[PDB]
Design a protein around this ligand. Structure first.
Ligand SMILES: NC(=O)c1ccc[n+]([C@@H]2O[C@H](COP(=O)([O-])OP(=O)(O)OC[C@H]3O[C@@H](n4cnc5c(N)ncnc54)[C@H](OP(=O)(O)O)[C@@H]3O)[C@@H](O)[C@H]2O)c1
Ligand SMILES: CCOc1ccc2c(c1)C=C(C(=O)NCc1cc(C(=O)O)c(C)o1)CO2
Length: 315
């Protein structure tokens, strides 16, 4: 299953999440992306930030050489990192991603976050006090540079990530806008279900793409250990038992049935293959209402030290 995007292109509704923390060897991204393609994933989510585009690209090339897939069967996403928001840096950042992945185009290029950072090669530029250094950029000019990347055929589609409604409206209301964002990739799961943003996006034909849909990797660097564990939720577990599925499968199917495209990261061969079973069963309307009741406005990626950024999305 795919969803038609507002530029006429198609996006598979289940995508494979590729982020792994730096303690994971980069050889693993190569191995698990091949396994995901073998399992049936066709939408692969990467980014400059992830330090894995070379390996994800090698996995794609290898499965093309196998004869398993063609390039046109794979939906590959990359993201513009926040130190590259100044408009003259956007196309060179995209070309660099394409060179690492050894691809001629991406299917989707996103602005990774609205929070601009000091330009440079450092992904996390830090001052003498250990504070990450912000930059001020008009994201409408960043967007204009993304539009030129689509016109050049380097990205089939363009979208955003981590935007709130006012940030989306800033793009949608931009004078001389040529391409709307096809999607907004945001944190979305039963403890933070984004119903308000989803209704807004639906009204603008913008696809919401859920990340941390299984509750995040709970990295101690960015997630409070005392936050509740999504997949231990009693309602999700009771529904998994009723359906003879797993809590992860319930969480993924929840998104599919409300019109959300869903990502799922796993570096485990058996859970990768399990997640493709989201297409094998259905939740009832009563099940959906019970999951809708779980929202607690819980942000695993709260970016607490960045709350003072002018573009922090949760203001
Ligand atoms: N645009 C952004 O700012 C942004 C931010 C966050 C994430 N993302 C994208 O979204 C992807 C997914 O989000 P995420 O990394 O936070 O992780 P997630 O999809 O919420 O998954 C969290 C953990 O679930 C476990 N898992 C997967 N399938 C499972 C299953 N069937 N049963 C039990 N546990 C399961 C995985 O562990 P195992 O690996 O051990 O299986 C994974 O570490 C990311 O990789 C990235 O591609 C983007
Ligand atoms: C206003 C400053 O902005 C910055 C600057 C530097 C940063 C961050 C934010 C945040 C980082 C971070 O959250 N890494 C963990 C992670 C990222 C993703 C993803 O998929 O996008 C996943 C699943 O985990 C890296 O260092």
């Amino acid at each position: 299953q795919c969803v038609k995007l507002n530029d006429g292109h198609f996006m598979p509704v289940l995508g494979f999440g590729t982020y792994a923390p730096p303690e994971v060897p980069r050889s693993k991204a190569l191995e698990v992306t091949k396994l995901a393609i073998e399992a049936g994933f066709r939408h692969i989510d990467s980014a400059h930030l992830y330090n894995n585009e070379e390996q994800v690209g090698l996995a794609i090339r290898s499965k093309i050489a196998d004869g398993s897939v063609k390039r046109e069967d794979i939906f590959y996403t990359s993201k513009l990192w926040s130190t590259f928001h100044r408009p003259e840096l956007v196309r060179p950042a995209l070309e660099n991603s394409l060179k690492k992945a050894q691809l001629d185009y991406v299917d989707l290029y996103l602005i990774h976050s609205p929070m601009s950072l000091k330009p440079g090669e450092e992904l996390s530029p830090t001052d003498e006090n250990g504070k990450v250094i912000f930059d001020i950029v008009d994201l409408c000019t960043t967007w204009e540079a993304m539009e030129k990347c689509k016109d050049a055929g380097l990205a089939k589609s363009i979208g955003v990530s981590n935007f709130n409604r006012r940030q989306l409206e800033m793009i949608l209301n931009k004078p001389g806008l040529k391409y709307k964002p096809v999607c907004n990739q945001v944190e979305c799961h039963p403890y933070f279900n984004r119903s308000k943003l989803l209704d807004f996006c639906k009204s603008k034909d913008i696809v919401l793409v859920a990340y941390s849909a299984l509750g995040s990797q709970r990295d101690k660097r960015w997630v409070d250990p005392n936050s509740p564990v999504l997949l231990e939720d009693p309602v999700l577990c009771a529904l998994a038992k009723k359906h003879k599925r797993t809590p992860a499968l319930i969480a993924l199917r929840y998104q599919l049935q409300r019109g959300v495209v869903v990502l799922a990261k796993s570096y485990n061969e058996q859970r990768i293959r399990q997640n493709v079973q989201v297409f094998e069963f259905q939740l009832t309307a009563e099940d959906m209402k019970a999951i809708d009741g779980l929202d607690r406005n819980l942000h695993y990626f709260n970016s607490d030290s960045f709350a003072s950024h002018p573009n922090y999305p949760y203001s």
